[PDB]
């Protein structure tokens, strides 16, 4: 068996909540962890020093966009993504096959790999599993994801895509020559079909990869089906390896999914500022003369320096500047939430944290989302 990259420092007695540590080449990451997209922070003017100061120790790179600009050859010459973008902490990249790829740019998937279309009936480009690993090797990220056959969808395509994802997993494993330097994660498929997802869990966990992600959720599915597939997945993924739930980032979803056993999360301008009661829409007139910060107890640079009134004025009169300040605060909120979740698990008070979180966000138990009450009850957390 390969060396494990995670250790558990605490577990909740009743629920599935885990507090862990990931030993990655650019530093240890505490879990559970929310992973912002680095290039989304740089698009909004956030420097490495600023993102580091918020507590971020791992962020995402989108391989498709990186592969367009600046392209893998330039990143290789720059000694990897860490060197190119001056980021000293950990990076996670996807396969480059589907995330943030428009369906207008995709032809049909074949066994050889993913096929990209070029404008105006131009020639197509193949991204094989092997080429996906080679590209992520050049990026030098600390965690790399397998190429999978992603579908949105009912009928035989779901089963077909699930089994192709298993075959592509094996090809990514065979192509990945340096597991000492980068950690390849498999991605569980099967959609909302309990039987297909069970098969995918059973088969993919036969591969000794250092971590597992949970794909194919965060679609249009019901919340009932969503949490049941998350719980099915965590019930069958190894306890001694990380569980990465892709595309889940709303605060309530995050807290419930931690309670179900997930360790890592990601999720992708209207003036909204995240707060424990939900969000503030700072464009509203009521904030024009509100001289308090977004949150007096937020430690972010925006809340130490700026009032709601000032941000409201800038959202109208200097919008780009406002968007920097709000993005900083919103990333800070996500990191603080996960930091507070992890502290509660270490102090063995996670059920109390959930109850306080839900009461602050919604109020009485009868105002909480029904799916969340049920999902939490399934792991022994009553509101």
């Amino acid at each position: 068996s390969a060396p494990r990259i995670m250790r558990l420092v605490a577990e909740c007695s009743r629920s599935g909540a885990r507090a862990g540590e990931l030993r990655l080449p650019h530093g240890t990451v505490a879990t559970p962890v929310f992973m912002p997209v680095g290039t989304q922070a740089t698009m909004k003017g956030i420097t490495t020093e600023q993102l580091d100061s918020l507590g971020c120790r791992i962020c995402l790179g989108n391989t498709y966009h990186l592969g367009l600009r600046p392209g893998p050859e330039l990143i290789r010459k720059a000694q990897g993504l860490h060197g190119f973008m001056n980021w000293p902490h950990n990076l996670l990249t996807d396969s480059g096959g589907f995330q943030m790829v428009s369906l207008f740019s995709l032809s049909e998937v074949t066994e050889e790999g993913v096929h990209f279309r070029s404008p105006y009936d131009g020639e197509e480009t193949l991204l094989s599993p092997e080429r996906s690993v080679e590209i992520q090797n050049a990026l030098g990220s600390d965690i790399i994801m397998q190429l999978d056959h992603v579908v949105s969808v009912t009928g035989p395509l779901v089963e077909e895509a699930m089994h192709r994802s298993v075959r592509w997993l094996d090809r990514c494993i065979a192509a990945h020559k340096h597991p000492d330097k980068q950690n390849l994660f498999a991605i569980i498929q099967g959609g909302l079909n309990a039987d297909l997802r069970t098969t995918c869990l059973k088969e993919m966990t036969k591969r000794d990869v250092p971590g597992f992600a949970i794909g194919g959720l965060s679609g249009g599915e019901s919340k009932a089906q969503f949490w049941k597939m998350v719980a099915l997945s965590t019930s069958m993924l190894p306890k001694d390896k990380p569980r990465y739930l892709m595309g889940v980032g709303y605060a309530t979803d995050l807290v419930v999914c931690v309670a179900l056993g997930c360790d890592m999360f990601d999720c992708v301008r209207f003036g909204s500022a995240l707060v424990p009661t939900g969000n503030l829409q700072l464009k509203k007139k009521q904030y024009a003369k509100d001289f308090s910060p977004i949150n007096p107890e937020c430690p972010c640079p925006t809340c130490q320096t700026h009032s709601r009134a000032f941000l409201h004025a800038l959202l109208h009169s200097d919008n780009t500047t406002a968007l920097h300040h709000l993005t900083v605060h919103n990333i800070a909120y996500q990191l603080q939430l996960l930091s507070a979740v992890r502290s509660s698990i270490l102090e063995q008070r996670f059920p109390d944290f959930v109850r306080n979180f839900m009461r602050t966000m919604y109020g009485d138990h009868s105002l909480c989302p029904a799916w969340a009450v049920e999902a939490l009850a399934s792991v022994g957390i009553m509101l």
Partner: protein
């Protein structure tokens, strides 16, 4: 209190003290801001820049439309924008986006920010200043004479009328008691009116003088400039607006001007360029030659951009229109420009300003 260290070849080296614990070096520049922010920079990233000036420039044109909120806030614009301990000079116009001309009358002057025209009579102007409460503020003035002896004569009389009316209203304002009015020299390109503006404004108890209307920069206006500063008292600071390029700055310093706007490094940033001129000219980071260039913008530069990032990365950020490109270019361009002003003062100390001038000109 302005105290001169020395004056060599008409260039004034000194400090302005009791601003009442703050000091400002002259010759020097003011930190340029737009809508109450240094462009693209935060409190945190501003703190990292070396040599940030001791006084920041605010523009009435970008703040006047926020009068209602600032008046409700009551504690002044510095506190409102989150810089409660900084010194602020409030000018009338923004030097980069000055708005349309032709709206000055004997009764009011107009400015434009993001939205609609803000027309300011003397009382409205002073009401706005009572909400802003800047440390220094340019008096309401007619700067559009050179934009005809008749037109230039009116700019002096209108500006003297505004000055006297504003001083009277300041005498009755509790909050503006700790603020300093800056008199404004007008007269356009008529020598007789420039001298009259200079002599008459100096009779009023202003804290300093703004040399208005010298934007370009002709040798004719440089001669008007020195003719004007010869009439002004030596113990008060001389500000100038619309003059920020390094060569022009040096010409004005030789003619008794002390304080300059720093909008030039902002203009460089907005066109995707980085200042590279030696001071002991610019490069366009969108050029394909930088796509693989892993050198910093300026070798040996101490700014956060150059110590930690490459030309290749900034090139990429510009091509994808990321705000981080403007952050890193602005940090470097301000750091470079403030370092230039440090080198001017060092050259004055060492009596080598003529040599520094030729070094700058050489790269122009």
């Amino acid at each position: 209190k302005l105290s001169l260290i020395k004056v060599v070849n008409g260039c004034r080296l000194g400090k302005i003290q009791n601003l009442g614990d703050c000091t400002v070096d002259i010759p020097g520049c003011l930190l340029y801001t737009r809508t109450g922010s240094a462009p693209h920079l935060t409190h945190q990233t501003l703190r990292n820049i070396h040599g940030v000036p001791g006084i920041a420039q605010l523009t009435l044109s970008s703040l006047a439309e926020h009068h209602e909120v600032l008046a409700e806030y009551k504690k002044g614009v510095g506190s409102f924008i989150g810089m409660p301990e900084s010194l602020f000079y409030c000018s009338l116009h923004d030097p980069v986006t000055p708005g349309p001309a032709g709206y000055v009358t004997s009764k009011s002057v107009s400015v434009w920010g993001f939205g609609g025209r803000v027309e300011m009579t003397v009382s409205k102007f002073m009401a706005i200043q009572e909400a802003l409460q800047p440390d220094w503020f340019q008096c309401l003035s007619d700067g559009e004479a050179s934009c005809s002896i008749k037109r230039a004569r009116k700019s002096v009389d209108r500006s003297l009328l505004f000055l006297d009316s504003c001083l009277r209203l300041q005498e009755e304002s509790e909050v503006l008691q700790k603020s300093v009015i800056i008199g404004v020299i007008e007269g356009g390109d008529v020598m007789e009116e420039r001298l009259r503006s200079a002599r008459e404004t100096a009779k009023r108890p202003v804290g300093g003088f703004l040399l208005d209307g010298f934007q370009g920069v002709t040798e004719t206006r440089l001669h008007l400039l020195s003719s004007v500063t010869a009439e002004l008292p030596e113990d008060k600071p001389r500000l100038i607006c619309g003059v920020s390029r390094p060569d022009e700055v040096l010409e004005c310093i030789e003619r008794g001007v002390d304080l300059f706007e720093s909008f030039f490094p902002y203009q460089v940033t907005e066109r995707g360029c980085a200042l590279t001129f030696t001071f002991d000219f610019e490069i366009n980071l969108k050029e394909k030659k930088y796509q693989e260039d892993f050198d910093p913008l300026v070798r040996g530069c101490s700014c956060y951009c150059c110590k930690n990032h490459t030309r290749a990365y900034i090139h990429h950020l510009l091509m994808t229109n990321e705000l981080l490109a403007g952050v890193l270019l602005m940090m470097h361009n301000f750091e470079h420009y403030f370092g230039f002003f440090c080198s001017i003062r060092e050259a004055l100390k060492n009596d080598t300003l003529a040599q520094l001038k030729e070094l700058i000109c050489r790269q122009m």
